[PDB]
Protein backbone atom coordinates (compact mmCIF):
# COMPACT_ATOMS: atom_id res chain seq x y z
CA UNK A 1 0.00 0.00 0.00
CA UNK A 2 1.34 3.43 -1.09
CA UNK A 3 0.96 6.44 1.30
CA UNK A 4 -2.13 7.63 -0.66
CA UNK A 5 -3.75 4.14 -0.39
CA UNK A 6 -3.06 4.24 3.36
CA UNK A 7 -4.71 7.66 3.95
CA UNK A 8 -7.74 6.68 1.75
CA UNK A 9 -8.22 3.33 3.57
CA UNK A 10 -8.29 5.35 6.86
CA UNK A 11 -10.91 7.80 5.45
CA UNK A 12 -13.05 4.90 4.05
CA UNK A 13 -12.99 3.06 7.40
CA UNK A 14 -14.02 6.25 9.21
CA UNK A 15 -16.85 6.91 6.68
CA UNK A 16 -18.13 3.29 6.75
CA UNK A 17 -18.42 3.57 10.58
CA UNK A 18 -21.18 6.16 10.00
CA UNK A 19 -23.12 3.49 7.95
CA UNK A 20 -23.31 0.44 10.32
CA UNK A 21 -26.17 -1.18 8.37
CA UNK A 22 -24.45 -0.92 4.96
CA UNK A 23 -27.00 1.34 3.16
CA UNK A 24 -24.04 2.55 0.99
CA UNK A 25 -22.07 -0.74 0.82
CA UNK A 26 -23.34 -1.98 -2.56
CA UNK A 27 -24.28 -0.74 -6.07
CA UNK A 28 -27.90 0.41 -6.33
CA UNK A 29 -29.44 -1.47 -9.29
CA UNK A 30 -32.85 -1.00 -11.02
CA UNK A 31 -33.97 -4.36 -9.55
CA UNK A 32 -33.35 -2.86 -6.02
CA UNK A 33 -34.68 0.64 -6.84
CA UNK A 34 -37.00 0.93 -9.89
CA UNK A 35 -36.06 3.65 -12.38
CA UNK A 36 -32.72 4.34 -10.64
CA UNK A 37 -30.66 4.28 -13.92
CA UNK A 38 -33.06 6.82 -15.51
CA UNK A 39 -32.28 9.35 -12.69
CA UNK A 40 -28.68 8.47 -11.68
CA UNK A 41 -26.17 8.25 -14.55
CA UNK A 42 -23.07 7.61 -12.41
CA UNK A 43 -23.82 5.28 -9.49
CA UNK A 44 -21.27 5.10 -6.62
CA UNK A 45 -21.00 3.09 -3.38
CA UNK A 46 -18.39 2.33 -0.64
CA UNK A 47 -17.72 -1.14 -2.13
CA UNK A 48 -16.71 0.31 -5.54
CA UNK A 49 -14.57 2.96 -3.69
CA UNK A 50 -12.84 0.20 -1.67
CA UNK A 51 -12.00 -1.70 -4.90
CA UNK A 52 -10.59 1.53 -6.39
CA UNK A 53 -8.29 2.01 -3.32
CA UNK A 54 -7.13 -1.65 -3.60
CA UNK A 55 -6.48 -1.23 -7.37
CA UNK A 56 -4.50 2.02 -6.65
CA UNK A 57 -6.94 3.95 -8.93
CA UNK A 58 -7.14 7.15 -6.81
CA UNK A 59 -4.32 9.55 -7.81
CA UNK A 60 -5.28 12.06 -5.05
CA UNK A 61 -7.55 12.68 -2.02
CA UNK A 62 -9.55 15.10 -4.35
CA UNK A 63 -10.59 12.14 -6.57
CA UNK A 64 -11.67 10.10 -3.52
CA UNK A 65 -13.72 13.07 -2.17
CA UNK A 66 -15.46 13.37 -5.59
CA UNK A 67 -16.59 9.69 -5.49
CA UNK A 68 -17.80 10.10 -1.88
CA UNK A 69 -19.70 13.31 -2.80
CA UNK A 70 -21.19 11.59 -5.90
CA UNK A 71 -22.48 8.66 -3.76
CA UNK A 72 -24.24 11.10 -1.35
CA UNK A 73 -25.50 13.42 -4.14
CA UNK A 74 -27.06 10.42 -5.90
CA UNK A 75 -28.93 9.43 -2.70
CA UNK A 76 -30.18 13.01 -2.17
CA UNK A 77 -31.41 13.24 -5.81
CA UNK A 78 -33.17 9.86 -6.09
CA UNK A 79 -34.70 9.91 -2.54
CA UNK A 80 -37.27 12.37 -1.07
CA UNK A 81 -36.08 14.52 1.92
CA UNK A 82 -38.36 12.72 4.45
CA UNK A 83 -36.68 9.33 3.75
CA UNK A 84 -34.03 7.50 5.76
CA UNK A 85 -31.89 7.32 2.56
CA UNK A 86 -31.79 11.08 2.04
CA UNK A 87 -31.25 11.90 5.76
CA UNK A 88 -28.39 9.44 6.13
CA UNK A 89 -26.77 10.68 2.88
CA UNK A 90 -26.97 14.33 4.03
CA UNK A 91 -25.62 13.54 7.51
CA UNK A 92 -22.69 11.42 6.20
CA UNK A 93 -21.85 13.93 3.42
CA UNK A 94 -21.36 16.75 6.00
CA UNK A 95 -19.54 14.57 8.56
CA UNK A 96 -17.33 13.02 5.84
CA UNK A 97 -16.22 16.32 4.28
CA UNK A 98 -15.58 17.81 7.74
CA UNK A 99 -13.39 14.78 8.67
CA UNK A 100 -11.30 14.76 5.44
CA UNK A 101 -10.59 18.52 5.62
C1 LIG B 1 -28.53 5.16 0.94
C2 LIG B 1 -28.32 5.39 -0.57
C3 LIG B 1 -28.27 4.06 -1.37
N1 LIG B 1 -29.61 3.43 -1.36
C4 LIG B 1 -29.77 2.20 -0.74
C5 LIG B 1 -30.96 1.54 -0.69
C6 LIG B 1 -31.07 0.18 -0.02
C7 LIG B 1 -31.48 -0.91 -0.80
C8 LIG B 1 -31.46 -2.23 -0.35
C9 LIG B 1 -31.01 -2.41 0.94
C10 LIG B 1 -30.62 -1.34 1.73
C11 LIG B 1 -30.62 -0.01 1.29
C12 LIG B 1 -30.30 -2.00 3.02
C13 LIG B 1 -29.75 -1.29 4.24
C14 LIG B 1 -30.53 -3.32 2.87
N2 LIG B 1 -30.90 -3.57 1.64
C15 LIG B 1 -31.12 -4.91 1.12
C16 LIG B 1 -30.08 -5.25 -0.02
C17 LIG B 1 -28.60 -5.13 0.44
C18 LIG B 1 -27.60 -5.46 -0.71
N3 LIG B 1 -27.89 -6.77 -1.36
C19 LIG B 1 -29.31 -6.90 -1.77
C20 LIG B 1 -30.28 -6.68 -0.57
C21 LIG B 1 -32.12 2.21 -1.29
S1 LIG B 1 -33.75 1.63 -1.31
C22 LIG B 1 -34.25 3.07 -2.12
C23 LIG B 1 -35.68 3.35 -2.35
O1 LIG B 1 -36.48 2.42 -2.26
N4 LIG B 1 -36.04 4.63 -2.53
C24 LIG B 1 -37.41 5.12 -2.72
C25 LIG B 1 -37.75 5.75 -1.32
C26 LIG B 1 -39.12 6.49 -1.25
S2 LIG B 1 -39.12 7.82 -2.46
O2 LIG B 1 -40.48 8.34 -2.62
O3 LIG B 1 -38.03 8.70 -2.13
C27 LIG B 1 -38.72 6.91 -3.95
C28 LIG B 1 -37.32 6.26 -3.78
C29 LIG B 1 -33.24 3.91 -2.38
C30 LIG B 1 -31.95 3.37 -1.94
C31 LIG B 1 -30.64 4.03 -2.03
O4 LIG B 1 -30.57 5.13 -2.58
Author numbering: 138 to 238
Give the exact sentences the study uses for this entry:
In this report, we describe a novel BRD9 bromodomain inhibitor, EA-89-YM35 (or EA-89), and a degrader-based analog (QA-68-ZU81, or QA-68) that incorporates the EA-89 warhead into a cereblon (CRBN)-targeting proteolysis-targeting chimera (PROTAC), to compare the efficacy of inhibition versus degradation to the impact seen with BRD9 knock-down (KD) by RNA interference. EA-89 is a potent and selective inhibitor that binds to BRD9 in a novel way. The binding mode of EA-89 determined by X-ray crystallography reveals that the thienopyridone head group binds to the acetyl lysine pocket similar to other known bromodomain chemotypes, forming a direct hydrogen bond with the conserved Asn100. Propyl substitution off the pyridone nitrogen accesses an adjacent induced hydrophobic pocket while the tetrahydro-2H-thiopyran ring picks up additional protein interactions, not observed with previous BI-based PROTACs, on the opposite side of the acetyl lysine pocket. HCT116 (colorectal cancer) was included as an out-of-lineage control, and JQ1, an established potent inhibitor of BET family proteins BRD2, 3, 4, was included as an inhibitor of bromodomain proteins with a distinct selectivity profile. We observed BRD9 degraders to induce differentiation of SKM-1 cells, in contrast to the BRD9 inhibitor, EA-89, which had little effect on SKM-1 differentiation and was less potent in inhibiting cell proliferation. As was observed with AML, the BRD9 degraders, QA-68 and dBRD9-A, showed higher potency against the B- ALL lines than the BRD9 inhibitor, EA-89.
Bromodomain-containing protein 9 (BRD9), an essential component of the SWI/SNF chromatin remodeling complex termed ncBAF, has been established as a therapeutic target in a subset of sarcomas and leukemias. In particular, the bromodomain-containing protein 9 (BRD9), a specific component of the non-canonical (nc-BAF/GBAF) mammalian SWI/SNF chromatin remodeling complex, is essential to maintain the transformed phenotype of AML. Paradoxically, the bromodomain in BRD9 has been shown to be an ineffectual drug target and degradation is required to reproduce the dependency seen with shRNA and CRISPR screens.
